[PDB]
């Protein structure tokens, strides 16, 4: 009752180990849930190319992810995408919005990912994902997601220009200190839900965080969101941007934390 799809093709990656982090996350989910992932795309090295170059390079991977996600969304299972970068979602979010026009997208990210070609300072496609799916610029992979149906969760320290694009489009923002499970439920109302996570939303892991207030979201806050969304309402989940080398102890520890956060939703879908 879980469909696992894994992107292994470059989609604008500027970090070295996000394809490897996706592979390791997928492996952990396969072992825990008795699944076999559908792996899509061919790895290629990271580079600091402009979105206008990285985007056409990624077309074959994006099209193949789109076709796999479409089948899964049209079937009866929970669609789980383990993605190297948020930019994979330029292919998936238009499908979600077309198949489920009432869905709310929870875009859980330390960033807004709401830049356009006019506003980006770095040229990075991964900073342009939600705005592209919402049609503020044309990714070549469709749009159709209403900004009114998108909620940024955990985002903070957003550039002033980008924050005003978000405001003018109607995208709600729930910063980490407001991102309780109930605050997220209040934003979703009766809608079916698609969850997209960029792991940079998380507070940088620190042993002694009992006496300071975190700037990012805590793993417990992410877990509480997964516990709160009714299984009958969850369309799918994207897990993106784990930058951890294959075979590293660090990846081993990171995927254990990931499995703990997603367990309430994935356990329910598996049962």
Q: Which parts are annotated binding residues for Mn(2+)?
A: 109, 111, 113, 198, 200
Q: Which helix (H) or strand (E) holds 133?
A: helix 129-133
Site for Mn ion in 182-201 (CB under 5 A): 198, 200
Residue 126 to residue 90: CA distance in whole angstroms: 9
Residue 127 Cβ vs Mn ion, minimum distance, rounded to whole Å: 7
CB of 111 to Mn ion, least distance (A): 4
Residue in the structure block whose two tokens are 């960029």: 198
Binding residue for Mn ion, selected from 113, 162, 203, 238, defined by CB under 5 A: 113
- Residue 159 makes contact with Mn ion by CB under 5 A: no
Among residues 4, 86, 179, 229, which is the contact residue for Mn ion, using CB under 5 A? 86
| Beta-sheet strands, E only, within 161-200 | 172-174, 193-198
Q: Are 106 and 44 in contact (CB under 8 A)?
A: no
Least distance between Mn ion and beta carbon 109 (Å): 4
- Report how far apart the first and last C-alpha atoms of the chain are (Å, whole number): 8
Residues with Cβ within 8 Å of residue 47, at least 6 apart in sequence: 13, 14, 54
The C-alpha atoms of residue 73 and residue 5 are separated, in whole angstroms, by 12
**Residue from 10, 100, 111, 141 in contact with Mn ion (CB under 5 A):** 111
260 near Mn ion, judged by CB under 5 A: no
Candidates 8-16, 60-68, 110-118, 251-259 — which segment interacts with Mn ion by CB under 5 A? Answer: 110-118
Q: Are 111 and 158 contacting, i.e. CB atoms less than 8 angstroms apart? A: yes
Out of 3, 13, 20, 109, the residue judged to bind Mn ion by CB under 5 A:
109
Binding site for Mn ion (CB under 5 A): 86, 109-111, 113, 198, 200
């Amino acid at each position: 009752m879980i469909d696992l799809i894994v992107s292994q093709g470059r989609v604008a990656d500027r970090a070295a180990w996000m394809i490897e982090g996706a592979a390791r996350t997928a492996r952990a989910l396969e072992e825990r849930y008795g699944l076999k992932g559908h792996y899509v795309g061919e790895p290629a090295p990271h580079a600091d190319d402009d979105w206008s170059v990285a985007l056409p390079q990624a077309r074959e991977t994006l099209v193949a992810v789109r076709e796999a996600a479409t089948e899964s969304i049209k079937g009866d299972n929970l669609t789980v995408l383990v993605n190297n970068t948020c930019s994979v979602s330029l292919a998936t979010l238009p499908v979600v919005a077309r198949e489920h026009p009432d869905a709310v997208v929870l875009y859980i990210d330390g960033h807004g990912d709401f830049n356009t070609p006019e506003t980006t300072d770095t040229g990075y496609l991964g900073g342009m994902v939600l705005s592209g799916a919402c049609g503020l610029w044309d990714s070549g992979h469709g749009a159709g997601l209403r900004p009114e149906q998108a909620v940024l969760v955990g985002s903070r320290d957003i550039d002033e220009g980008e924050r005003e694009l978000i405001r003018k489009a109607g995208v709600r923002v729930i910063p980490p200190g407001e991102a309780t499970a109930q605050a997220v439920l209040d934003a979703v109302k009766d809608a079916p839900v698609w969850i997209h996570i960029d792991w940079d939303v998380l507070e940088p892991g620190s042993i002694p965080a009992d006496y300071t207030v975190p700037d990012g979201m805590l793993p417990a806050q992410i877990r509480a969101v997964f516990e709160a969304i009714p299984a009958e309402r969850l369309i799918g989940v994207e897990l993106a941007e784990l930058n951890a080398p294959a075979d590293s102890e660090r990846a081993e520890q990171a995927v254990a934390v990931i499995l703990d956060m997603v367990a309430p939703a994935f356990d329910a879908a598996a049962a």
